[PDB]
Design a binder for these strands. Structure first.
Length: 475
RNA sequence: CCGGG
RNA sequence: UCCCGGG
């Protein structure tokens, strides 16, 4: 987005400063080129003379304005995808009750009861539990008063910027490219869930190529579904974006919201209104307040869904801007926010689409670094989706999500205090797909120290997970 | 609590 | 932080 104003200010929102991610015994063995993001501006691991506060917001390069003709084209694409979407999900998009929005429904998990509340509550020193009753599914006066302002479209808010405490490639650590998290007020999250929660629930439940969304999928089971779909196409592309979230233009966001969340598709009028409050935002980071036009706040309710929907419209838009007679049948895709796999029998030229995506403010590049440009004839077994390759399991003949051993090494190399046992169990569920020898090697550092699930036990669990009756081949 | 986006 | 998936 475009920074329009950055006045310094009285009140101060102090972040975090130091990581909770401490090295494990595995770190000494694998010595990964990965470490915790820089959270302090004076982190010695940083490159000298590189201030952390600058690079955080460098992603805000501007808010691409589109022509009348590009907007009408985009409107057509948004409406075309919307048609497909609401056809599959139905039109029961009436507001969720307060209770439902808090407690969730089938396809939509309940709100986190003790996550950050946002502004202005964090300046008062107050937790989510004080504002909202998560067991009961009810709200205090302050939230109800905010609820009332949103009804009448008079509600205004600020986003609380947090530095993301996570493992990053050391190049990005040293370059100070710590990701941020735009924390919205808990009431904003609540109302958004009220306005579009059922839609979201339906999306999650209906995940797959048809709606072009993997939000809600379970890679253990769904890799067989997705893998077999995409293997039917002659060409598959693995597309990377540069700062996807920041670079959604005001025009694209507004038109997408206008076409997808219409009252004629069952939504309350304020579905459109509440989503449109994400366009022009005020961000609070320490003593500064930054006003941004364009871009999606990473950490609002349904950020993943909104990004996924945009991804879908972008691909349609870019193809129709370059080629003639392009429809939704012309290709297939699945995305998860900025992450995307696209396939087609037509030999599309994604190199030629680069400028057409640029007209939206988005920079596409191939997922592999080498080979200067996009290439034809790539298959499903060459691409990364959700940091997972599609490899055929030779025991069952099903697709399994394989993570790169270097990534698993990095994950296993760091942990927060007193979680190591728990993390190992969780990560073993990722690592089983790398096969027995690699599984043994990844956990070898932890032997004698923690309980490591046997390879065999997780393999049988998985064989049941994918279908179930494949397990019931007792010969 | 862990992974992914 | 938001969702998603798994304990």
């Amino acid at each position: 987005g475009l920074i329009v104003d950055t006045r310094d200010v009285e009140e101060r929102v102090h972040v975090a400063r130091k990581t909770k991610l401490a090295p494990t015994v595995a770190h000494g063995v694998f010595n990964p080129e990965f470490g915790p993001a820089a959270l302090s501006n004076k982190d010695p691991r940083l490159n000298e003379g590189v201030v952390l506060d600058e690079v955080i917001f460098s992603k805000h390069k501007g808010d691409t304005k589109m022509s009348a003709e590009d907007k009408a084209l985009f409107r057509r694409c948004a409406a075309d995808y919307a048609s497909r979407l609401h056809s599959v999900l139905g039109t029961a998009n009436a507001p969720l009750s307060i209770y439902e929005a808090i407690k969730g429904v089938d396809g939509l998990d309940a709100m986190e009861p003790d996550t950050a509340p946002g502004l202005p509550w964090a300046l008062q020193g107050k937790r989510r539990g004080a504002l909202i009753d998560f067991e009961n599914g009810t709200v205090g006066p302050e939230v109800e008063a905010a609820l009332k302002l949103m009804e009448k479209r008079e509600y205004k808010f600020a986003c609380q910027t947090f530095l993301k405490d996570e493992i990053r490639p050391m190049e990005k650590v040293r370059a100070g490219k710590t990701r941020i998290v735009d924390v919205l007020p808990v009431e904003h999250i609540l109302y958004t869930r009220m306005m579009i929660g059922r839609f979201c629930a339906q999306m999650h439940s209906n995940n797959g190529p048809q709606i072009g969304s993997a939000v809600g999928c379970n890679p253990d089971v769904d890799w067989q579904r997705f893998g077999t779909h995409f293997a039917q196409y002659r060409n598959v592309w693995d597309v990377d974006y540069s700062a996807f979230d920041a670079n959604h233009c005001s025009d694209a966001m507004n038109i997408m919201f206008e076409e997808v969340f219409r009252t004629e598709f069952g939504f309350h009028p304020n579905a459109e209104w509440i989503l449109k409050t994400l366009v022009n935002t005020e961000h609070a980071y320490e003593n500064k307040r930054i006003t941004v036009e364009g871009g999606m706040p990473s950490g609002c309710s349904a950020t993943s869904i909104i990004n996924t929907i945009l991804n879908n419209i972008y691909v349609l838009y870019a193809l129709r801007r370059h080629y003639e007679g392009v429809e939704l049948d012309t290709y297939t895709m699945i995305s998860y926010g900025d992450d995307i796999v696209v396939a087609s029998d037509y030999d599309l030229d994604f190199e030629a689409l680069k400028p057409h995506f640029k007209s939206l403010g988005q920079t596409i590049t191939p997922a592999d670094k080498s080979d200067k440009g996009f290439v034809l004839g790539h298959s499903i077994t060459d691409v990364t989706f959700l940091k997972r390759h599609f490899h055929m399991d030779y025991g069952t003949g099903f697709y399994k999500p394989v993570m790169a051993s270097k990534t698993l090494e990095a994950i296993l190399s760091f942990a927060r205090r007193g979680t190591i046992q728990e993390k190992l169990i969780s990560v073993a569920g990722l690592a089983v797909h790398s096969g027995p020898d690699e599984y043994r090697r990844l956990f070898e550092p932890f032997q004698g120290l923690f309980e490591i699930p046997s390879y065999r036990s997780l393999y049988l669990r998985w064989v049941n997970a994918v279908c179930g009756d494949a397990a019931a081949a007792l010969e």
